[PDB]
Symmetry: C3
Subunit: 259 residues, 3 copies
């Protein structure tokens, strides 16, 4: 069993993948719980940011290989899905930061690719090696990965299943930052608390949803430009648009109301 | 109020955001002037490249925070895209010589250019969400197409500052240089295009590159447009002159089309 | 009258195609393009071929089109339309269509010393072989616009830093590195796993599939693979601590 732990404090929810005996291996039940937690936390107005992390020393070692030799495609309803976490982090209004504190392999990595922002441990092993086991990348990696690193880096990681370093993840655009493992979660939390304190709630929600809706649906430039205008009318019609500059000029923290 | 200055010499037009008392702050009226200049310079056959830059020591500090209260105290034609046409809609190449600080819309408008050279000493940020508004001037569309979704999400959702070096490392900028060298490097690049790149070749290439991004053209549609553009170009004078001039090691004498 | 020749060698699951034209630094012609497209199709269809490596007769990869004093896509099918992985071992100079055809490969390994450029606009023509589409999907729109609108030379190091290339190495090491990568795929990656992964990655780019459509195909491809012997063999080999033996190989 890998459990999902949850703690909410001062506007930041931390979800921890907790399976010490298996380096937090992914399971079907863990995927069900993670999707349910994403939805509930997204809906909770008190939650400004979600941080996803693993019980040290790993983030998520992915599918249990020794336990996956006879996972036949049995006919059933509901059927199997290659997207075992729904909703995906990129479907939420709430920003999601993956504090990848150690090894992230297979679906451990492809689920981390759903987050807006990734901070990776320098000491971690990272790979998407599904094709070396006779299956294929999952959880939308065929779509998320080229949108980070371009098609060549994506093809190399998906077609060879090769391991890559935290440093190469930053160099190629997969990850935002790399740090020693013991510093990763703290950096993610500092970033999360800065969003919770200093970024307006509706500003974050509309910006995240336009960024990702445009990717998900293939919006044209004209369609994105029109939605920025419509989102601006929504934001400028709320007092938070006056509070941001007022608080800055006063030298005080903003008192966000949201809408 | 920041003015727009314009100088055209030897096929290169330089537009300067000139507001020395405010780090070249942006206003809607400046945006209107910039869009109008883009359109006129695009239509001017003598202009091969447009370079956009700021009066030192800044590129453009964006919307003044100090001016926000007056704005929200007071338009049916409001747009989050206050510069139209965008640089990426033109036939004419646009280089942003980002000679210093570029903040907010100062940065998002710079993202419209084909090429960015950034000052190593500059402060760069898109901090709109920290002020209760959101990224503007198509940043939700231009930025992931430069740096990928993760760097884009970090810059847009946190509003954090970033260095010129990080801009180059991630794909936002083409080059970084000390501030006082940025404009000169942009001008050398602009004059190389004006001298050595055929006018219709630049126009068709820029428009296919950007039209395909703007409208999500399929690979098949892009391939068909390349074929059409080639048939247009191969039957023109400049397709003969380019190789002829190269074989002589002389500057080409372009006619355009 | 000699031409750039297309040579082919298949050994241990890896096909090497060589652009062999040392008299012209392996220049490209429409006829070479026809031969390359035909070889890509045949090798894709050959079950014995796990990976195709494209390379040039030293010291060049491909000097591009001849200059003098119909389709802009002269290689069909393109490498990215195949089921079979394609690695371009860009062992030297790749200019013009020499570079834009290299951009069709899944993976590029570039010689550190080589000159690279897409200089068509400097010759009164324009980028070709889908460079307007492949290039921004590697390096972003700014690096793409710079390379296409200036036509200027760029380095292998810059190619790796921007995402155009996967690795850069001294010229004399490039083919060896591509072959080691190819043989690792042939040995350690299941055939249908590579085919479906390649086709979904590229089809989604070619036709602008929505995220929902990509997710649905991942599920359908997983159902296909879970119904295949290689999905049993991968875990079984791992548990045994032995190399996998893929079906029909
Ligand atoms: K929430
Ligand atoms: K013009
Ligand atoms: K084959
Ligand atoms: K990069």
């Amino acid at each position: 069993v890998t459990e999902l732990h949850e703690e909410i404090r001062d506007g930041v929810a931390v979800l921890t993948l907790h399976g010490p005996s298996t380096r937090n291996s992914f399971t079907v039940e863990l995927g069900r719980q993670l999707g349910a937690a994403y939805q509930r936390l997204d809906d909770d107005p008190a939650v400004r940011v979600i941080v996803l992390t693993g019980a040290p020393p790993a983030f998520c070692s992915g599918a249990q290989i020794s336990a996956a030799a006879e996972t036949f495609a049995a006919p059933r309803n509901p059927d199997f899905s290659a997207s075992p976490v729904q909703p995906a982090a990129f479907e939420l209004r709430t920003p999601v930061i993956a504090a990848v504190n150690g090894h992230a392999i297979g679906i451990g990595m492809t689920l981390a690719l759903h987050a807006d922002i990734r901070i990776l441990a320098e000491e971690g092993r990272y790979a998407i090696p599904q094709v070396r086991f006779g299956v294929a990348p999952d959880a939308l990696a065929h779509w998320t990965l080229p949108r980070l690193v371009g098609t060549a880096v994506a093809a190399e990681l998906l077609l060879t299943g090769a391991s890559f370093s935290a440093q190469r993840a930053v160099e190629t655009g997969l990850a935002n930052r790399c740090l020693p493992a013991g510093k990763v979660l703290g950096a993610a939390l500092r970033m999360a608390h800065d969003i919770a304190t200093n970024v307006a709630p509706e500003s974050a929600a509309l910006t995240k949803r336009l960024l990702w809706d445009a990717q998900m649906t293939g919006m044209s430039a004209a369609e994105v430009a029109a939605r920025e205008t419509a989102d601006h009318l929504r934001l400028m019609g709320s007092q938070d648009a006056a509070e941001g500059p007022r608080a800055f000029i006063d030298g005080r923290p903003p008192r966000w109301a949201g809408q």
